[PDB]
Design a protein around this ligand. Structure first.
Ligand SMILES: CCS(=O)(=O)Nc1cccc(-c2cn(C)c(=O)c3ccccc23)c1
Ligand SMILES: CCS(=O)(=O)Nc1cccc(-c2cn(C)c(=O)c3ccccc23)c1
Lengths: 109, 109
Protein backbone atom coordinates (compact mmCIF):
# COMPACT_ATOMS: atom_id res chain seq x y z
CA UNK A 1 0.00 0.00 0.00
CA UNK A 2 2.95 2.31 0.66
CA UNK A 3 4.24 2.11 -2.92
CA UNK A 4 0.79 3.10 -4.18
CA UNK A 5 0.37 5.88 -1.61
CA UNK A 6 3.82 7.12 -2.62
CA UNK A 7 2.68 7.26 -6.26
CA UNK A 8 -0.50 9.11 -5.27
CA UNK A 9 1.58 11.78 -3.50
CA UNK A 10 4.62 12.26 -5.74
CA UNK A 11 2.95 11.62 -9.14
CA UNK A 12 -0.85 12.01 -9.09
CA UNK A 13 -1.17 14.87 -6.61
CA UNK A 14 1.84 16.71 -8.06
CA UNK A 15 0.57 16.48 -11.65
CA UNK A 16 -2.98 17.47 -10.72
CA UNK A 17 -1.58 20.48 -8.84
CA UNK A 18 0.53 21.59 -11.84
CA UNK A 19 -2.51 21.57 -14.15
CA UNK A 20 -3.65 25.08 -15.06
CA UNK A 21 -7.20 24.37 -13.83
CA UNK A 22 -6.25 23.19 -10.34
CA UNK A 23 -6.44 26.54 -8.53
CA UNK A 24 -10.14 26.40 -7.41
CA UNK A 25 -9.35 23.01 -5.81
CA UNK A 26 -6.11 23.90 -3.97
CA UNK A 27 -7.94 24.82 -0.73
CA UNK A 28 -11.34 23.96 0.75
CA UNK A 29 -14.36 25.70 -0.73
CA UNK A 30 -14.77 28.81 1.46
CA UNK A 31 -18.55 29.16 1.48
CA UNK A 32 -18.51 32.46 3.39
CA UNK A 33 -15.94 34.07 1.10
CA UNK A 34 -17.86 32.82 -1.95
CA UNK A 35 -21.31 33.59 -0.46
CA UNK A 36 -22.65 30.04 -0.92
CA UNK A 37 -25.27 29.78 1.85
CA UNK A 38 -26.18 26.11 1.27
CA UNK A 39 -22.73 24.64 0.51
CA UNK A 40 -21.87 23.29 3.98
CA UNK A 41 -25.45 22.06 4.43
CA UNK A 42 -25.68 19.91 1.31
CA UNK A 43 -22.02 18.98 0.64
CA UNK A 44 -21.53 16.62 3.57
CA UNK A 45 -17.79 15.92 3.24
CA UNK A 46 -15.98 18.82 1.54
CA UNK A 47 -12.67 17.80 -0.01
CA UNK A 48 -9.79 19.56 -1.77
CA UNK A 49 -6.22 19.05 -2.94
CA UNK A 50 -4.52 20.58 0.11
CA UNK A 51 -6.45 18.36 2.54
CA UNK A 52 -5.35 15.31 0.52
CA UNK A 53 -1.79 16.64 0.40
CA UNK A 54 -1.71 17.11 4.17
CA UNK A 55 -3.25 13.68 4.79
CA UNK A 56 -0.64 11.96 2.60
CA UNK A 57 2.21 13.90 4.23
CA UNK A 58 0.95 12.95 7.70
CA UNK A 59 0.45 9.28 6.73
CA UNK A 60 -3.27 9.58 7.48
CA UNK A 61 -4.35 6.98 4.92
CA UNK A 62 -3.83 3.28 5.59
CA UNK A 63 -4.48 2.21 1.98
CA UNK A 64 -4.36 3.86 -1.42
CA UNK A 65 -8.09 3.16 -1.93
CA UNK A 66 -8.89 5.53 0.94
CA UNK A 67 -6.94 8.32 -0.78
CA UNK A 68 -8.57 7.58 -4.15
CA UNK A 69 -11.97 7.91 -2.46
CA UNK A 70 -11.02 11.43 -1.34
CA UNK A 71 -9.98 12.43 -4.87
CA UNK A 72 -13.28 11.07 -6.18
CA UNK A 73 -15.23 12.93 -3.49
CA UNK A 74 -13.65 16.24 -4.50
CA UNK A 75 -14.85 15.78 -8.09
CA UNK A 76 -18.37 14.54 -7.30
CA UNK A 77 -18.84 17.31 -4.71
CA UNK A 78 -18.17 19.80 -7.53
CA UNK A 79 -20.53 18.01 -9.92
CA UNK A 80 -23.24 17.68 -7.25
CA UNK A 81 -23.15 21.32 -6.13
CA UNK A 82 -22.84 22.93 -9.55
CA UNK A 83 -24.79 22.42 -12.79
CA UNK A 84 -23.89 21.29 -16.32
CA UNK A 85 -22.21 24.02 -18.31
CA UNK A 86 -20.64 25.87 -15.38
CA UNK A 87 -16.99 26.70 -16.00
CA UNK A 88 -16.02 25.22 -12.62
CA UNK A 89 -17.45 21.91 -13.88
CA UNK A 90 -15.34 22.17 -17.04
CA UNK A 91 -12.23 22.62 -14.91
CA UNK A 92 -13.09 19.68 -12.64
CA UNK A 93 -13.69 17.50 -15.69
CA UNK A 94 -10.24 18.34 -17.05
CA UNK A 95 -8.59 17.40 -13.75
CA UNK A 96 -10.71 14.26 -13.36
CA UNK A 97 -9.57 13.11 -16.81
CA UNK A 98 -5.94 13.69 -15.86
CA UNK A 99 -6.54 11.97 -12.52
CA UNK A 100 -7.99 9.00 -14.37
CA UNK A 101 -5.00 8.87 -16.75
CA UNK A 102 -2.45 8.90 -13.93
CA UNK A 103 -4.37 6.21 -12.01
CA UNK A 104 -4.06 3.95 -15.07
CA UNK A 105 -0.26 4.15 -14.78
CA UNK A 106 -0.18 3.33 -11.06
CA UNK A 107 2.38 0.60 -10.26
CA UNK A 108 0.23 -2.44 -9.48
CA UNK A 109 1.61 -3.36 -6.06
CA UNK B 1 -5.11 -2.55 -24.91
CA UNK B 2 -7.02 -5.73 -25.74
CA UNK B 3 -6.36 -7.30 -22.32
CA UNK B 4 -7.79 -4.24 -20.57
CA UNK B 5 -10.91 -3.76 -22.75
CA UNK B 6 -11.28 -7.47 -22.15
CA UNK B 7 -11.19 -6.97 -18.36
CA UNK B 8 -13.57 -4.01 -18.64
CA UNK B 9 -16.17 -6.20 -20.37
CA UNK B 10 -16.11 -9.50 -18.44
CA UNK B 11 -15.11 -8.09 -15.03
CA UNK B 12 -15.94 -4.42 -14.55
CA UNK B 13 -19.13 -4.29 -16.63
CA UNK B 14 -20.42 -7.62 -15.29
CA UNK B 15 -19.91 -6.71 -11.63
CA UNK B 16 -21.49 -3.27 -11.99
CA UNK B 17 -24.52 -4.84 -13.70
CA UNK B 18 -25.02 -7.43 -10.95
CA UNK B 19 -24.97 -4.74 -8.25
CA UNK B 20 -28.44 -4.26 -6.76
CA UNK B 21 -28.33 -0.52 -7.54
CA UNK B 22 -27.51 -0.83 -11.25
CA UNK B 23 -31.03 -0.95 -12.68
CA UNK B 24 -31.50 2.85 -13.26
CA UNK B 25 -28.28 2.75 -15.32
CA UNK B 26 -29.00 -0.32 -17.50
CA UNK B 27 -30.63 1.69 -20.32
CA UNK B 28 -30.37 5.31 -21.47
CA UNK B 29 -32.23 7.84 -19.36
CA UNK B 30 -35.58 8.10 -21.16
CA UNK B 31 -36.44 11.75 -20.59
CA UNK B 32 -39.91 11.44 -22.12
CA UNK B 33 -40.81 8.42 -19.96
CA UNK B 34 -39.49 10.19 -16.84
CA UNK B 35 -40.86 13.63 -17.85
CA UNK B 36 -37.50 15.42 -17.61
CA UNK B 37 -37.94 18.34 -20.03
CA UNK B 38 -34.35 19.62 -19.74
CA UNK B 39 -32.36 16.36 -19.65
CA UNK B 40 -31.43 16.14 -23.35
CA UNK B 41 -30.69 19.88 -23.34
CA UNK B 42 -28.18 20.06 -20.50
CA UNK B 43 -26.68 16.53 -20.55
CA UNK B 44 -24.82 16.68 -23.85
CA UNK B 45 -23.60 13.05 -23.97
CA UNK B 46 -25.97 10.70 -22.14
CA UNK B 47 -24.40 7.37 -21.29
CA UNK B 48 -25.52 4.10 -19.70
CA UNK B 49 -24.36 0.54 -19.02
CA UNK B 50 -26.09 -0.89 -22.10
CA UNK B 51 -24.42 1.57 -24.47
CA UNK B 52 -21.01 0.67 -23.03
CA UNK B 53 -21.86 -3.03 -23.25
CA UNK B 54 -22.78 -2.86 -26.94
CA UNK B 55 -19.71 -0.73 -27.71
CA UNK B 56 -17.46 -3.31 -26.03
CA UNK B 57 -19.32 -6.09 -27.84
CA UNK B 58 -18.95 -4.32 -31.19
CA UNK B 59 -15.22 -3.53 -30.73
CA UNK B 60 -16.09 0.17 -30.81
CA UNK B 61 -13.32 1.30 -28.43
CA UNK B 62 -9.72 1.25 -29.60
CA UNK B 63 -8.29 1.81 -26.10
CA UNK B 64 -9.42 1.05 -22.56
CA UNK B 65 -9.16 4.73 -21.61
CA UNK B 66 -12.01 5.63 -23.97
CA UNK B 67 -14.26 3.04 -22.35
CA UNK B 68 -13.22 4.26 -18.89
CA UNK B 69 -14.18 7.77 -19.99
CA UNK B 70 -17.71 6.58 -20.84
CA UNK B 71 -18.06 5.00 -17.38
CA UNK B 72 -17.00 8.30 -15.79
CA UNK B 73 -19.40 10.22 -18.03
CA UNK B 74 -22.29 8.02 -16.87
CA UNK B 75 -21.55 8.84 -13.22
CA UNK B 76 -20.90 12.57 -13.62
CA UNK B 77 -23.98 12.94 -15.85
CA UNK B 78 -26.00 11.66 -12.89
CA UNK B 79 -24.22 13.91 -10.39
CA UNK B 80 -24.59 16.94 -12.68
CA UNK B 81 -28.30 16.49 -13.39
CA UNK B 82 -29.39 15.55 -9.89
CA UNK B 83 -28.87 17.10 -6.45
CA UNK B 84 -27.00 15.98 -3.31
CA UNK B 85 -29.09 13.69 -1.15
CA UNK B 86 -31.15 12.32 -4.05
CA UNK B 87 -31.54 8.56 -3.83
CA UNK B 88 -30.43 8.20 -7.46
CA UNK B 89 -27.15 9.85 -6.44
CA UNK B 90 -26.59 7.37 -3.59
CA UNK B 91 -26.94 4.46 -6.01
CA UNK B 92 -24.59 6.11 -8.52
CA UNK B 93 -22.06 6.63 -5.71
CA UNK B 94 -22.26 2.97 -4.68
CA UNK B 95 -21.64 1.81 -8.24
CA UNK B 96 -18.84 4.32 -8.72
CA UNK B 97 -17.16 3.03 -5.56
CA UNK B 98 -17.33 -0.51 -6.98
CA UNK B 99 -16.04 0.79 -10.32
CA UNK B 100 -12.87 2.23 -8.79
CA UNK B 101 -12.31 -0.98 -6.81
CA UNK B 102 -12.39 -3.11 -9.95
CA UNK B 103 -10.24 -0.57 -11.79
CA UNK B 104 -7.46 -0.97 -9.22
CA UNK B 105 -7.40 -4.69 -10.08
CA UNK B 106 -6.98 -4.12 -13.82
CA UNK B 107 -4.05 -6.05 -15.35
CA UNK B 108 -1.25 -3.66 -16.30
CA UNK B 109 1.64 -4.59 -18.60
C1 LIG C 1 -9.48 27.56 -3.62
C2 LIG C 1 -10.79 27.37 -2.82
S1 LIG C 1 -11.58 28.97 -2.47
O1 LIG C 1 -13.06 28.75 -1.92
O2 LIG C 1 -10.68 29.75 -1.39
N1 LIG C 1 -11.64 29.90 -3.89
C3 LIG C 1 -12.46 29.68 -4.95
C4 LIG C 1 -12.41 30.63 -5.99
C5 LIG C 1 -13.23 30.48 -7.13
C6 LIG C 1 -14.09 29.37 -7.24
C7 LIG C 1 -14.17 28.40 -6.21
C8 LIG C 1 -15.03 27.26 -6.27
C9 LIG C 1 -14.45 25.97 -6.24
N2 LIG C 1 -15.19 24.82 -6.29
C10 LIG C 1 -14.55 23.52 -6.27
C11 LIG C 1 -16.55 24.90 -6.38
O3 LIG C 1 -17.23 23.85 -6.43
C12 LIG C 1 -17.22 26.14 -6.40
C13 LIG C 1 -18.63 26.21 -6.49
C14 LIG C 1 -19.29 27.44 -6.52
C15 LIG C 1 -18.55 28.63 -6.46
C16 LIG C 1 -17.15 28.58 -6.38
C17 LIG C 1 -16.45 27.35 -6.35
C18 LIG C 1 -13.33 28.57 -5.07
C1 LIG D 1 -33.06 2.48 -16.94
C2 LIG D 1 -33.14 3.89 -17.55
S1 LIG D 1 -34.87 4.46 -17.65
O1 LIG D 1 -34.91 6.01 -18.05
O2 LIG D 1 -35.64 3.55 -18.72
N1 LIG D 1 -35.64 4.23 -16.15
C3 LIG D 1 -35.38 4.93 -15.02
C4 LIG D 1 -36.16 4.62 -13.89
C5 LIG D 1 -35.95 5.31 -12.68
C6 LIG D 1 -34.96 6.30 -12.59
C7 LIG D 1 -34.16 6.63 -13.72
C8 LIG D 1 -33.14 7.63 -13.67
C9 LIG D 1 -31.81 7.23 -13.92
N2 LIG D 1 -30.76 8.11 -13.91
C10 LIG D 1 -29.41 7.67 -14.17
C11 LIG D 1 -30.98 9.43 -13.62
O3 LIG D 1 -30.02 10.22 -13.60
C12 LIG D 1 -32.28 9.92 -13.36
C13 LIG D 1 -32.49 11.29 -13.07
C14 LIG D 1 -33.78 11.77 -12.81
C15 LIG D 1 -34.88 10.89 -12.82
C16 LIG D 1 -34.68 9.53 -13.11
C17 LIG D 1 -33.38 9.01 -13.38
C18 LIG D 1 -34.38 5.93 -14.93
Amino acid sequence: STNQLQYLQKVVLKDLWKHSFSWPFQRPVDAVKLQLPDYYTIIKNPMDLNTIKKRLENKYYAKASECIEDFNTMFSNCYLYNKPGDDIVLMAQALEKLFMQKLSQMPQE
